[PDB]
Design a protein around this nucleic acid. Structure first.
Lengths: 740, 251, 704
RNA sequence: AGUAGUAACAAGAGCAUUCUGCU
């Protein structure tokens, strides 16, 4: 008897056992090497779907740009990029006619949020492509480097503290033909390693001030960093995603804020909803289109994906959409929201980290960069890379490839939803005046479209009308990955609807293991992860109990904190056994101290020290919650009481890089940390609530020191000798500020 | 000698040229950006790195004061801390046997503000321990994303007022142009200044304690049942996908 | 003008006024009278605060030339906003004064009063009473100066001396005369957002339009003044008829099967032996190491008497096999003489070959490689296709069966209080009691132990050739511990900097299986014959040879990380089964745990016998789901994820037909090609494709 | 050799979306 688990589907429905078809327990497919080939594949496919457009050169960057929109209509079901401007403007006008006052209210909220948003909002989010370093620094590091390069040139409107003045500085920086940037360079020397007697070239990364051009800074400002996406499920082959620079982040923030205010009031959008709100939206679109106005109404549902969703939507269509949504608004707001589609239409894509070339005679290898690929003879490649380089050769501008058509993955994630919801909103009964109608639900690129009609020919006509109207605006429904059935079972973004029952499998199940901060922090994070998956990610009760047991087992292995009555002999088992043998109430000991597991389904919201506080020994709770413990950092006032337990220690950190002397670049972080520490010494509320100001840090600290000395003199504990010494030292600090 | 230590520290910092440039050029609004400045290779898997760091003898880095608080060797011969190679700074490498030794044979103290700082979680545990559970009822579930009250806060004080109350209590000089505009606000402020007279605690700790007592938070959540504040905390327990546990909180 | 300010005022006053203007966000081109007025008011406040001291006794002594005394006035105006408000709050907290509504301009410690000083150009009476109505209630000393040559205060009191205000009014008359000479007196006396494009971004804005437009202003005026006149219907008339989504009807009784590839047979690619694994065990170990894995390995090796001289039974066809034989002899000789907890083998030539040391080409920088002629690119080839062999179905058969041991010992929970905690405990205990003695739990524990010890030895013994035994620990039916040893893993050098850097190792696994019966399963292995063992049964007792499967394998931090977490398979198999119980309870409206887990009939189809479809119980179904999750974790690849994601649509199409929902596809042939693109050479994905074909044939024969 | 799979690792930049003990 050969065992076949798929025969389980002969008894239960497929949606009742769909979790068997998700192999999400093994390692997800990671990419090896570079993301150069996938970037060139994205660029070539984006220019090949759009090849019947108009080729032009940019007046500023010199880059070859392709203009597919308002082009020839498609003649076959290949994915087209030829979107029509009149159809896009008609769909946005129809979305305005169906929802009156939506555009005005969302634009008014965007204007209310533009004037009150600071530059520090750009320190949030993902890692940003630093045009200074040509690398993906974090958001605050890239923003600080951009502000430093703006301030060392003649651009200082970002000292106003609001975001829109930084964006005006970003736009004014394009006129400087002598942009002086402080990059990172690298020295090298062949030093013998004193562990294996081997010669290795050690590198010393420092800093150097280099001067750009107008065209060089314009290429670096319009550059996305393209890398492969790793740990992506459900695909055989890898893909390249992109990361924006710093000169485009605030404009994209304001455009996506506008589109998020739009999508939060459109009921046909699957954004920005969570799990159970998406289940409620599936139920809402299944109840809206269940109304039998007559006795014979065929209701069909298309579960659909869109093929090449990002390669086919142009930034010019988004420019027309953001100029039509903001109709009747002030022209500064229209221009500010129109900056980001202009920068995305003139964009350029960095071509990754080159390739690796192998010398078999000399038995060596070398990774040559993507800038050196346009001056190496084409016989040194394989056939696919020969085809890719020969296709992309006329698009290269200074080590980057021009990508004027198409969008990259995840940039305008909420505006394309507005376009898709406009296509879904086209087909109402009181608007089409035809024998069919539809209503849908639109995520970023997945859709679930319900077409009602009276005969199956009317359903086919509604299918063709939706598909052709989508093709008019640059939306290609994947005929491979879409299917139509009757109404009652469908799928939308891995939410499986069957007859009033929704199964959520969009989110992968987490490890339910140790997070890796310390003992108390990982205990809190583990119970909060289990509780949040019980609420928002739809974890069962018994599955949550097994997750509690698996997390406690993993937590006891990782921190070597098995129970005192265990027969295992780890490193800490002797001290934990000593603590177990001298404790009266063993139920009060923490899991990190060898106690039992206190947690169950009902008390995952309660911290561990709080949960076992009434069962602890008083000497044990005194030693554990001792406010003079050496493990938690103690801020000087003598220091304060530490209200954190002794399990909230700090692990030893290793930020080292092999053969790399990164001493010249790790200094600025510790200098910034010393500055924030001494500012918190002067202003004690700087860590609780962020300090607002426009003067310098040194000027505010001297103004704090002078009046602190004056208040302490006039009210006690500082004498006039001490007051005079503090004021004379403030004079000396100001004197070194002047002639420094 | 109170305010001259930090002023001589600032003099020593302004003596350096790069720190002088950074302190004079970066404003108080830009210090909210350079606080999060991180230059260095980031650990892509902290879980795996903790797994292989805990297999080493000394994974903890605590301050040098631990060289005088705990011994260097345990009773069974376990070394508790070692120094670093040519680094006499105030940070040494510690063992987790040191943490277990502090929790079994360190100095006892007074713990009376730990149920006072974390009174929210003790109130949660006292409400759950005295709760009375009803039976489970299985049916299909319709859960609506409602902005429910996760943290209740205080009566007649909004979230915009309680934060100003806390900033007037624990940081009275660092307020700004904000003014207090209620008649029970001043009585609450006087009572909180009275209760926090003798606290040898960090001001952020009493700030966060008054925050988790007074500041009201709300969050969108799928609720199907009672939307009271003492039911959103047991939202992982009183409802599921196909069932609904009936539970009345004790109190 | 601004030059009139910069002619005769102090440069510190100019600095204060420039910072005051930069506060409000303006350039001195649009308003320079603001610069002159702020500088005038600031110099008036400075001369009000210049040379006013308080000594140690506490008397207002006007000095000239600080060391023994302090100031009398605290200057508030001219600072930043938040600095001045911190000054005001730090004064009011000490003196218990109420805070003013706005910022005062000075503070007197002598009178303890906030001074508001206002310089105007109109008459002093109207501006003084306007400022008094502005500050009605707050105890603020007002003082109004003008260019008319007067001064008006609160209650007509002057806290300054007469010569002081004489100096200030003298300077004000000097400024009045200097305004009425350069033609600037009357032009000073009678006194949305913006986002425009710079010209470079204007040229970028013109370049990013539809091709019918040459100007951004023109396109913006077109879009803002657009009215639709039936454009979509006109383009849909103009579009071709070949652009259509034609619904093809889906009938699974007519669709074809998946095309599995052809070539050689697929070989075994697991990291450890699954159903051919043999373990040397110790029962109740107490041998003075007792937990240290090399001590447990020596104690388990001491149970096997009957070694032989090892001879290569089955040769690895691509590699040198004498190196594998010498590797086994070196490992066996080094275990017999090692002292301590860990064993690092001496790096001989055969071990260097087996771990692949020296095979990487020397990575150099390209500027040192520019004059290198034969510098061809790395080659990137697709996998070679493989035919489905019958050993992987036998592995999945033996993986879903019970054993005599208990492989998972979960940790304790809290005591149950709620009724849903009792329901969850009953459900979880039913699934655990059916699943804990399975063979897939032994594979879970083998992978957890192997990848955990491989990670620890990879991170603490990077430069060394570490020996890692393959230990599991189980409990019997009577509750007695047992430690099993399956073989060894000689780790290579592991300097793992990426998530996908390869640590090479050599796995030497004990077995009883003759490798020459299924030789295509063992392509990468070199099998030796290391001994003989008395295999005992109820009647027969024979002497079968014990073989050792030696191969070179490799892993990474991603694969080891996901192998240490294989207990999540135990979670996922519980997440599936419970969801079935969370479906039957969503209709029948009771606790369906006990009808699920006590009706242990044979109504669950999980088998394909030659006589038809075999049905097992619910416990067999849970063991089969656990083994499917375990084999998803062992044989994970991109091919499995692609095939699962693309065949789930075909499964939902078959279910849409079975519910009589009339399913239809737009392009079924492309979906079939996308499914067949992923079935390349993974044995698990070929087994899953043949499983999908068998399920399709079963769902056809249930309808005809 | 081997891992692996559209390009890499098999040490010599990581160019990010003195230890190892799990009943």
């Amino acid at each position: 008897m050969d065992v076949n688990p798929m025969l389980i589907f002969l008894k239960v429905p497929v949606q009742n056992a769909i979790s068997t078809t998700f192999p999400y327990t093994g390692d997800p497919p990671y990419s090896h090497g570079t993301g150069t080939g996938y970037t060139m594949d994205t660029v070539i496919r984006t220019h090949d779907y759009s090849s019947r457009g108009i080729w032009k050169t940019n007046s500023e960057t010199g880059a070859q740009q392709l203009n597919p929109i308002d082009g020839p209509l498609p003649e076959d079901n290949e994915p087209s990029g030829y979107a029509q401007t009149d159809c896009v403007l008609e769909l946005i006008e129809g979305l305005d006619r169906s929802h009156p006052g939506l555009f005005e209210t969302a634009c008014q909220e965007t204007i209310d949020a533009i004037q009150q948003t600071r530059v520090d909002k750009l320190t949030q989010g993902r890692q940003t492509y630093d045009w200074t370093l040509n690398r993906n620094q974090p958001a605050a590091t890239a923003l600080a480097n951009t502000i430093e390069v703006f301030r060392k040139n003649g651009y200082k409107l970002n000292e106003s503290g609001r975001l829109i003045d930084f964006l005006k500085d970003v736009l004014l920086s394009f006129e400087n033909d002598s942009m002086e940037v402080t990059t990172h360079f690298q020295k090298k020397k062949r030093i013998r390693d004193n562990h294996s007697k081997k010669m290795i070239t050690q590198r010393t990364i420092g800093k150097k001030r280099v001067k750009l051009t107008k065209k060089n800074y314009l290429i670096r400002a319009l550059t996305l960093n393209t890398m492969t996406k790793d740990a992506e499920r459900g695909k055989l082959k890898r893909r390249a995603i992109a990361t924006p620079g710093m000169q485009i982040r605030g404009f994209v923030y304001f455009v996506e804020l506008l589109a998020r205010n739009i999508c939060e009031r459109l009921e046909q959008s699957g954004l920005p909803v969570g799990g159970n709100e998406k289940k409620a939206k599936l139920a809402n679109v299944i109840k809206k289109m269940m109304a039998k106005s007559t006795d014979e109404e065929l209701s069909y549902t298309i579960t659909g994906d869109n093929t090449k969703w990002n390669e086919n939507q142009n930034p010019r269509i988004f420019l027309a959409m953001v100029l039509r949504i903001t109709a009747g608004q002030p022209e500064w707001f229209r221009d500010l929201l129109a900056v980001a589609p202009i920068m995305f239409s003139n964009k350029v894509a960095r071509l990754g980290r080159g390739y690796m070339f192998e010398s078999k005679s000399m038995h060596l290898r070398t990774q040559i960069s993507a800038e050196n690929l346009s001056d190496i003879n084409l016989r040194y490649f394989n056939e696919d890379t020969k085809k890719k380089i020969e296709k992309i050769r006329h698009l290269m501008v200074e080590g980057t490839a021009s990508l004027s058509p198409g969008m990259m993955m995840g940039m305008f994630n909420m505006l394309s939803t507005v376009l898709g919801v406009s296509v879904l909103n086209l087909g109402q009964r009181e608007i089409l005046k035809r024998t069919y109608w539809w209503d849908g639900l639109q995520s970023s690129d997945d859709f679930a479209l319900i077409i009602n009609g009276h005969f199956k020919e009317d359903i086919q006509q509604g299918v063709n009308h939706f598909y052709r109207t989508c093709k008019l605006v640059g939306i290609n429904m994947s005929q491979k990955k879409s299917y139509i059935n009757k109404t009652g079972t469908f799928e939308f973004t891995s939410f499986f609807y069957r007859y009033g029952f929704v199964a959520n499998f969009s989110m992968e199940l987490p490890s339910f293991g140790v997070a890796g901060n310390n003992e108390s922090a990982d205990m809190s994070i583990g119970t909060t992860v289990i509780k949040t998956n019980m609420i928002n990610n739809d974890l069962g009760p018994a599955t949550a109990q097994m997750a509690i047991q698996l997390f406690i087992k993993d937590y006891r292995y990782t921190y070597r904190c098995h129970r005192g009555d265990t027969n295992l002999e780890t490193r800490r088992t002797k001290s934990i056994k000593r603590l177990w043998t001298e404790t009266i109430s063993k139920a009060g000991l923490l899991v990190a101290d060898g106690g039992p597991n206190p947690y169950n389904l009902r008390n995952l919201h309660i911290p561990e020290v709080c949960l076992k506080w009434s069962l602890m020994d008083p000497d044990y709770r005194g030693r554990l919650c001792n406010p003079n413990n050496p493990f938690v950092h103690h801020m000087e006032v003598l220091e304060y009481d530490a209200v954190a337990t002794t399990h909230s220690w700090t692990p030893k950190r290793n930020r080292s890089i092999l053969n790399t002397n990164q001493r010249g670049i790790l200094e600025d972080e510790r200098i910034y940390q010393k500055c924030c520490q001494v500012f918190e010494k002067f202003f004690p509320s700087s860590t609780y609530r962020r300090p607002i100001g426009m003067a310098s840090m040194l000027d505010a600290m001297l103004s704090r020191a002078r009046i602190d000395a004056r208040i302490d003199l006039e009210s006690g504990r500082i004498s006039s000798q001490d007051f005079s010494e503090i004021t004379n030292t403030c004079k000396a600090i100001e004197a070194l500020k002047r002639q420094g | 000698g109170s305010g001259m230590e930090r002023i001589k520290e600032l003099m020593e910092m302004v003596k350096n040229s790069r720190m002088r440039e950074i302190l004079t050029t970066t404003s108080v609004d830009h210090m909210a950006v350079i606080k999060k400045y991180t230059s260095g290779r980031q650990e892509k898997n902290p879980a795996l790195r903790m797994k292989w760091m805990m297999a080493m003898k000394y994974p903890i880095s605590a301050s040098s004061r631990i060289r005088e608080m705990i011994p260097e060797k345990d009773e069974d011969g376990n070394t508790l801390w070692t120094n670093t190679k040519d680094a006499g700074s105030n940070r040494v490498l510690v063992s987790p046997n040191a943490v277990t030794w502090w929790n079994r044979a360190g100095p006892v103290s007074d713990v009376v503000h730990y149920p006072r700082v974390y009174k929210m979680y003790f109130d949660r545990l006292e409400r759950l321990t005295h709760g009375t559970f009803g039976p489970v009822k299985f049916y299909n579930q319709v859960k609506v994303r409602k902005r429910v009250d996760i943290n209740p806060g205080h009566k007649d004080l909004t979230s915009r007022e309680a934060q100003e109350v806390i900033m007037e209590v624990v940081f009275p000089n660092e307020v700004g142009a904000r003014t207090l505009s209620s008649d029970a606000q001043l009585t609450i402020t006087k009572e909180k200044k009275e209760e926090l007279k003798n606290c040898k605690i960090s001001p952020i700790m009493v700030a966060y304690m008054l925050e988790r007592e007074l500041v009201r938070r709300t969050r969108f959540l799928p609720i199907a049942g009672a939307t009271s504040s003492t039911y959103v905390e047991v939202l992982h327990l009183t409802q599921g996908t196909c069932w609904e546990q009936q539970y009345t909180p004790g109190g | 003008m601004e030059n009139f300010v910069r002619t005769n005022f102090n440069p510190m006053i100019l600095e204060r006024a420039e910072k005051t203007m930069k506060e409000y966000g303006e350039n001195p081109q649009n308003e320079g009278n603001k610069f002159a007025a702020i500088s005038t008011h600031m110099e008036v406040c400075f001369m009000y605060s210049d040379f006013h001291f308080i000594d140690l006794e506490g008397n207002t002594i006007v000095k000239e030339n600080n060391a023994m005394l302090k100031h009398r006035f605290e200057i508030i105006e001219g600072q930043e906003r938040n600095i001045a408000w911190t000054i005001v709050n730090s004064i009011c907290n000490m003196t218990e004064n109420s805070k003013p509504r706005f910022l005062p301009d000075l503070y007197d410690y002598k009178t303890n009063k906030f001074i508001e000083i206002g310089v105007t150009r109109r008459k002093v009476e109207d501006y003084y009473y306007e400022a008094a109505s502005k500050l009605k209630g707050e105890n603020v000393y007002i003082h109004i100066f003008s260019f008319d040559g007067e001064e008006m205060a609160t209650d007509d009191e002057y806290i300054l001396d007469e010569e002081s205000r004489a100096r200030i009014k003298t300077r004000l008359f000097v400024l009045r005369q200097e305004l009425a000479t350069a033609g600037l007196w009357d032009s000073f006396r009678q006194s949305e957002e913006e986002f425009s494009y710079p010209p470079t971004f204007q040229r970028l804005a013109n370049q990013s339009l539809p091709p019918s437009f040459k100007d951004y202003h023109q396109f913006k005026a077109y879009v803002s003044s657009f009215k639709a006149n039936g454009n979509i219907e006109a383009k849909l008339g103009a579009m071709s008829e070949k652009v259509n989504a034609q619904i093809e009807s889906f009938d699974p009784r007519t669709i074809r099967e998946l095309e599995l590839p052809e070539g050689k047979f697929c070989t075994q690619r697991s990291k450890f032996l699954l159903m051919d694994a043999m373990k040397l065990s110790v029962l109740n170990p107490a041998h003075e190491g007792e937990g240290i894995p090399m001590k447990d390995a020596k104690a388990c090796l001491d149970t096997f008497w009957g070694w032989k001289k090892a001879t290569i039974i089955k040769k690895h066809e691509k590699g040198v096999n004498t190196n594998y034989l010498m590797i086994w002899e070196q490992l066996l000789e080094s275990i017999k003489e090692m002292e301590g907890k860990f064993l690092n083998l001496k790096k001989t030539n055969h071990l260097k070959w087996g771990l692949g040391e020296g095979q990487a080409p020397e990575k150099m920088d390209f500027e040192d490689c520019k004059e290198v002629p034969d510098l061809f690119q790395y080659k990137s080839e697709p996998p070679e296709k493989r035919k489905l062999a019958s050993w992987i179905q036998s592995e999945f058969n033996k993986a879903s069966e019970l054993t005599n041991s208990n492989w998972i010992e979960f940790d304790e929970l809290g005591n149950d209080v709620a009724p849903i905690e009792h329901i969850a405990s009953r459900r979880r205990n039913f699934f655990t009691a059916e699943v804990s003695q399975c063979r897939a739990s032994e594979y879970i524990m083998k992978a957890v132990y192997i990848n955990t010890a491989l990670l620890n030895s990879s991170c603490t013994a990077m430069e060394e050739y570490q020996v890692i035994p393959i230990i599991t620990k189980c409990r019997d039916t009577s509750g007695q511990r047992r430690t099993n040893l399956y073989g060894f893993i000689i780790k290579g050098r592991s300097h793992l900097r990426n998530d996908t850097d390869v640590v090479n190792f050599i796995s030497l696994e004990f077995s009883l299986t003759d490798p020459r019966n299924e030789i295509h399963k063992w392509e990468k292995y070199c099998v030796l014959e290391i001994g003989d063992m008395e295999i005992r049964t109820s009647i027969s007792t024979i002497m079968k040879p014990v073989y050792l499967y030696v191969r070179t394998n490799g892993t990474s931090k991603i694969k080891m990380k996901w192998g240490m977490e294989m207990r999540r398979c135990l979670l996922q198999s519980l997440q599936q089964v419970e969801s079935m119980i969370e479906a039957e309870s969503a209709v029948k409206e009771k606790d369906m745990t006990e009808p699920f887990f006590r009706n242990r009939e044979n109504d669950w189809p999980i088998g394909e016998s030659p006589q038809g479809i075999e049905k097992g119980t619910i416990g067999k179904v849970c063991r089969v789901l656990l083994a499917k999750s375990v084999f998803n974790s062992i044989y994970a690849s991109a091919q499995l994820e692609g095939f699962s994601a693309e065949s789930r649509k075909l499964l939902l199409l078959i279910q849409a037909f079975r519910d009589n929902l009339d399913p239809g596809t737009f392009d079924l042939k492309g979906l079939y090609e996308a499914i067949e693109e992923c079935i390349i050479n993974d044995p698990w994905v070929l087994l899953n494709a043949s499983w999908f074909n068998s399920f399709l044939k079963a769902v056809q024969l249930s309808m005809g």
